[PDB]
Design a binder for these strands. Structure first.
Length: 69
DNA sequence: CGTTGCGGCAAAGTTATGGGTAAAGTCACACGTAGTCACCATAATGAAATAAGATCACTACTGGGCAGTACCAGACTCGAACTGATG
């Protein structure tokens, strides 16, 4: 079952937050960025992904680009 | 007719994949990361020096005029004397 179980708006928001609040010149930890994402999701009325989902997708962005950013 | 092998049908069984939730791990807080030669071109004087220029001193060459001399008359001026009118 490769179908994504999260709603599309939840994806888009979490993509945006991983892009613009984690890979940034601050070296923020994953817990704080997840908390900010959850706060934004609760403002937007969408489903907030769990912390394990955040860590797993962050683990999908590893390599050169993230280490450089 | 009965038996036997074969094949369709539809649960049922097995892997796989992307989610959530408690719970075992993981690791930094322990004063500390910035810090230091090496590098060769450009401005930038200040000195070193210029290359020509400026003036002195001497040597030789060549224009060339001034104080003084001299004659041949022409012409005005006037001693000295002559001579005529006169009161």
């Amino acid at each position: 079952n490769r179908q994504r179980k999260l709603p599309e708006d939840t994806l888009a928001i979490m993509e945006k937050f991983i892009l613009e609040d984690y890979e940034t010149l601050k070296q923020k930890r994953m817990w704080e960025v997840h908390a900010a994402l959850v706060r934004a999701c609760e403002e937007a009325g969408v489903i907030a992904p769990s912390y394990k989902a955040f860590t797993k997708e962050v683990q999908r962005r590893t390599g050169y680009e993230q280490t450089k950013k």
